[PDB]
Amino acid sequence: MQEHYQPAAIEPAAQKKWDDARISNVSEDASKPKYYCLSMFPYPSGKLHMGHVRNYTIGDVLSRFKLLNGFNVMQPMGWDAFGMPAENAAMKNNVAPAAWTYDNIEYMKTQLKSLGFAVDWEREVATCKPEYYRWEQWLFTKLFEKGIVYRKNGTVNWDPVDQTVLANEQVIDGRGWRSGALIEKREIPMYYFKITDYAEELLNDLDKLEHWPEQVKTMQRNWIGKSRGMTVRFAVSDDSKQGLEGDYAKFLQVYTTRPDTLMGATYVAVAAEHPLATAAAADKPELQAFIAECKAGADMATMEKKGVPTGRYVVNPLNGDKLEVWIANYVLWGYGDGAVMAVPAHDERDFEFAAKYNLPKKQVIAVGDNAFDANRWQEWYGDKENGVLVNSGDLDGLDFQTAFDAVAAKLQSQGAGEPKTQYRLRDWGISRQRYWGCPIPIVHCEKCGNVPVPADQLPVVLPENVVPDGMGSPLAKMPEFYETSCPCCGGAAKRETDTMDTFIESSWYFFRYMSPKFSDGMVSAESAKYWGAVDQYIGGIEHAILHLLYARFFTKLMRDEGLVNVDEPFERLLTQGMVVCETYYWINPADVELTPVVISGTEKMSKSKNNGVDPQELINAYGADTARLFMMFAAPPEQSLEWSDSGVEGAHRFLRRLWRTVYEYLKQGGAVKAFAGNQDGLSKELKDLRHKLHSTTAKVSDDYGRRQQFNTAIAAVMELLNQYDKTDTGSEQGRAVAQEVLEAAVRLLWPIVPHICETLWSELNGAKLWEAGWPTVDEAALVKSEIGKLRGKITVAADASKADLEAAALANEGAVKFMEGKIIVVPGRLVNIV
Numbered sequence: 001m002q003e004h005y006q007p008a009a010i011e012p013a014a015q016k017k018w019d020d021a022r023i024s025n026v027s028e029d030a031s032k033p034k035y036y037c038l039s040m041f042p043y044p045s046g047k048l049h050m051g052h053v054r055n056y057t058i059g060d061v062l063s064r065f066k067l068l069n070g071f072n073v074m075q076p077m078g079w080d081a082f083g084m085p086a087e088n089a090a091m092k093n094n095v096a097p098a099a100w101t102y103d104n105i106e107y108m109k110t111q112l113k114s115l116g117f118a119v120d121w122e123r124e125v126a127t128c129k130p131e132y133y134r135w136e137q138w139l140f141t142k143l144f145e146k147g148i149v150y151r152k153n154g155t156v157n158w159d160p161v162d163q164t165v166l167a168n169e170q171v172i173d174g175r176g177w178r179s180g181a182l183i184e185k186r187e188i189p190m191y192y193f194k195i196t197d198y199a200e201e202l203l204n205d206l207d208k209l210e211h212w213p214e215q216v217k218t219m220q221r222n223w224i225g226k227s228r229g230m231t232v233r234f235a236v237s238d239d240s241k242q243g244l245e246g247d248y249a250k251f252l253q254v255y256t257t258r259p260d261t262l263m264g265a266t267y268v269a270v271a272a273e274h275p276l277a278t279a280a281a282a283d284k285p286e287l288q289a290f291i292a293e294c295k296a297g298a299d300m301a302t303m304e305k306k307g308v309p310t311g312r313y314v315v316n317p318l319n320g321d322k323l324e325v326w327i328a329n330y331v332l333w334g335y336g337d338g339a340v341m342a343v344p345a346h347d348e349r350d351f352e353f354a355a356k357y358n359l360p361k362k363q364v365i366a367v368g369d370n371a372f373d374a375n376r377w378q379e380w381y382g383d384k385e386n387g388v389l390v391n392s393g394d395l396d397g398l399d400f401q402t403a404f405d406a407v408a409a410k411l412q413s414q415g416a417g418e419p420k421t422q423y424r425l426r427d428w429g430i431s432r433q434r435y436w437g438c439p440i441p442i443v444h445c446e447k448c449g450n451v452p453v454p455a456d457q458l459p460v461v462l463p464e465n466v467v468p469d470g471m472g473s474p475l476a477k478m479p480e481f482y483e484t485s486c487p488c489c490g491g492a493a494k495r496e497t498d499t500m501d502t503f504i505e506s507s508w509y510f511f512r513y514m515s516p517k518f519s520d521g522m523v524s525a526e527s528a529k530y531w532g533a534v535d536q537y538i539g540g541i542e543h544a545i546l547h548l549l550y551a552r553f554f555t556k557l558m559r560d561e562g563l564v565n566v567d568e569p570f571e572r573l574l575t576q577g578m579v580v581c582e583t584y585y586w587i588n589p590a591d592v593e594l595t596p597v598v599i600s601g602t603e604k605m606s607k608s609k610n611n612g613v614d615p616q617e618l619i620n621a622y623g624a625d626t627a628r629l630f631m632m633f634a635a636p637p638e639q640s641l642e643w644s645d646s647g648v649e650g651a652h653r654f655l656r657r658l659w660r661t662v663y664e665y666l667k668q669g670g671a672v673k674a675f676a677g678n679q680d681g682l683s684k685e686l687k688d689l690r691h692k693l694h695s696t697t698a699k700v701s702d703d704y705g706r707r708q709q710f711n712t713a714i715a716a717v718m719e720l721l722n723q724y725d726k727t728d729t730g731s732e733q734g735r736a737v738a739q740e741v742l743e744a745a746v747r748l749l750w751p752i753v754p755h756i757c758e759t760l761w762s763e764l765n766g767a768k769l770w771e772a773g774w775p776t777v778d779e780a781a782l783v784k785s786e787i788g789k790l791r792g793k794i795t796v797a798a799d800a801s802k803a804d805l806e807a808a809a810l811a812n813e814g815a816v817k818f819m820e821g822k823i824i825v826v827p828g829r830l831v832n833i834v
């Protein structure tokens with residue numbers, strides 16, 4: 001054994017050893033219990049930085065923990081390769097996005113392989129390859145035929161200068177980002193997944209996810225946004241029918257989730273495009289301009305709420321009050337009825353609207369004896385659970401649910417309204433007017449219409465010999481791509497030139513890893529049956545809503561097609577915290593050392609301030625194990641992690657110390673058979689070290705397996721080494737216990753720092769580390785030894801309580817013979833019955 005720790009020497013040798021034994025290349029091995037650990041696969045956008053490395057280290061720690069415990073572990077890796085990053089670089093560097101993407105993949109694969117992650121590279125996928133994306137084209141065509149995917153006009157942000165469609169993120173103050181030209185809203189045909197048909201399933205199945213963080217489930221429930229409420233109709237007054245046709249001449253219909261407060265409605269509000277808004281605005285120039293301002297305008301709660309009165313009235317069907325209709329900019333045409341009622345005394349938005357315009361407020365709910373103040377909003381005004389109806393005539397005294405049913409009763413009997421369930425969830429628009437994405441497998445025929453490509457003609461292949469220029473999608477300018485023949489009639493036709501939302505690839509990639517070479521389907525039945533669901537998913541909170549909901553949606557779509565048999569894709573979910581670092585100017589922290597540049601503020605590792613720390617720089621300086629160790633030790637995985645030059649150094653020193661501990665141990669006599677069995681006759685000090693050892697094994701196992709807090713696992717091993725360092729292990733029985741401690745220490749740490757622990761393990765023991773397996777707890781090592789006047793002595797467990805001593809004291813042969821018909825308890829010394 002070499003004396004000094006040389007990571008640049010041992011790490012490639014250890015990685016070579018693991019690849020040769022194919023430890024991480026796995027099959028559907030029925031002889032071993034499966035474990036599917038998955039980290040969110042990256043966009044191949046450049047270099048990974050320490051932030052990404054934290055994510056993949058965590059996955060590797062859990063994977064290797066399960067490996068050592070005998071599982072058949074699949075830890076797959078892959079490339080989320082479509083999307084905007086490459087198209088910017090395609091414009092930026094005058095390079096094909098494909099060429100730039102594949103180049104990126106190679107740099108990052110070697111980056112990852114150098115960190116020593118236990119990854120099945122034979123299951124690697126790149127989502128920009130036709131062998132991948134053909135299967136999401138296939139699913140598209142199957143769902144299109146069933147109407148689960150449909151085509152429909154939607155409105156988009158058109159920039160007339162750049163001549164491209166803009167995302168709302170790129171629409172600042174009404175104008176485009178790279179142009180500052182006023183955005184034109186355009187109606188164009190687009191494709192949608194009917195995700196609203198699955199809203200109830202997506203919502204209720206969250207309850208199954210007992211090993212998901214509660215806030216993730218809460219964000220999903222709120223995004224879906226189910227409500228059980230009331231459709232309510234307000235008769236238009238005789239004086240207000242002016243201009244209205246059809247059912248709009250008869251009644252104004254709203255949706256409300258507080259029908260229990262209908263007796264406190266003091267005005268109503270309609271969207272700019274509502275027919276009432278149009279009829280009122282006919283001879284009223286002020287309303288015309290307000291309608292116009294609304295049409296041009298996420299930012300809902302942020303925007304100043306505005307309205308104008310219309311002079312039109314509707315009648316409350318419960319109390320007969322004539323209420324004025326307002327046009328308001330917060331009422332959106334396309335959600336529910338495009339009109340709402342307003343209850344300023346019990347809804348905070350209505351309260352502010354009403355306090356702005358001096359509109360009436362009517363208290364119709366009281367909460368205990370809390371007093372009502374029409375000039376100050378108070379949280380209890382909105383109380384749905386502890387309030388009870390006041391000023392509501394007949395309804396006076398009911399609670400929310402009974403008044404709901406009473407109002408539903410009354411309304412239905414008048415024909416004036418019915419209960420209704422609504423969802424905030426919109427359908428999922430997947431059309432993108434971008435080149436670097438999966439082609440939509442539709443052909444447009446002037447005779448047959450929009451027709452799906454037949455399955456045997458899939459994939460529709462995206463040409464990779466393209467350099468976009470940002471002045472439109474190149475596919476719409478590429479005759480050799482879009483000219484084709486109709487699959488239904490043989491006539492001349494045109495391919496769809498929009499590509500798919502690149503969330504589509506990340507919505508099923510975890511199934512493709514089960515059989516990434518399968519050519520007869522998205523995923524083979526044999527492999528989906530074996531791998532089941534992802535046991536453990538690790539990724540950033542930024543994907544807690546859309547990506548996770550889409551992946552759950554796709555799972556249920558695929559189950560309903562018969563391709564998988566689970567309802568939910570991810571059993572456990574771990575949300576690793578951000579990684580932050582000081583900034584400098586914008587100079588990368590590897591171009592800087594400190595005691596001329598400006599040492600600015602600490603913030604998330606990103607390209608914005610060029611403060612991403614390149615893991616390759618960190619490997620070249622200290623080795624992979626030091627990088628892994630620093631990030632697993634610096635903070636619990638969920639907490640944010642501050643980059644620290646001294647933290648990295650102190651991780652490295654720990655690895656030197658661990659190296660030197662095994663070396664000095666082996667210099668003083670070479671390896672011995674590790675202590676095992678009965679420890680009676682061991683000295684107190686070696687008993688205490690064995691106690692620390694097996695306590696440490698139980699804690700690390702709990703920290704890896706239950707708590708997933710790796711930083712405290714490492715601290716516990718350092719404690720063991722500390723007690724080892726103060727224990728005389730020179731004797732024969734001492735060396736056997738030292739061997740036991742070191743064989744367990746290097747195994748306990750192997751998931752965190754596998755290169756050094758693989759190397760040290762082999763100097764200690766000739767067996768293969770993964771066959772020796774995860775260290776076991778020796779419970780016998782966890783048992784400590786047993787411990788008026790005076791008349792009796794008793795033997796007590798070392799963990800005996802003060803009532804166990806008083807128990808055995810009161811029942812002693814010398815006590816009872818001196819009792820003749822207070823009990824001061826000194827633990828470990830004496831007990832006296834006075």
Ligand SMILES: CC(C)C[C@H](N)C(=O)NS(=O)(=O)OC[C@H]1O[C@@H](n2ccc(=O)n(C)c2=O)[C@H](O)[C@@H]1O
Nearest residue numbers: 040041042043051052055080506539540547578579
């Ligand atoms: C499933 C699909 C939609 C994932 C998508 N390709 C993505 O976000 N791709 S990605 O390439 O952006 O990120 C890959 C993973 O790395 C994590 N990450 C990234 C930067 C960072 O600072 N920190 C601290 C950090 O943890 C990030 O949360 C994610 O799970």
Ligand SMILES: [Mg+2]
Nearest residue numbers: 208209210211
């Ligand atoms: Mg369960």
Ligand SMILES: [Zn+2]
Nearest residue numbers: 445448486489
């Ligand atoms: Zn045709």
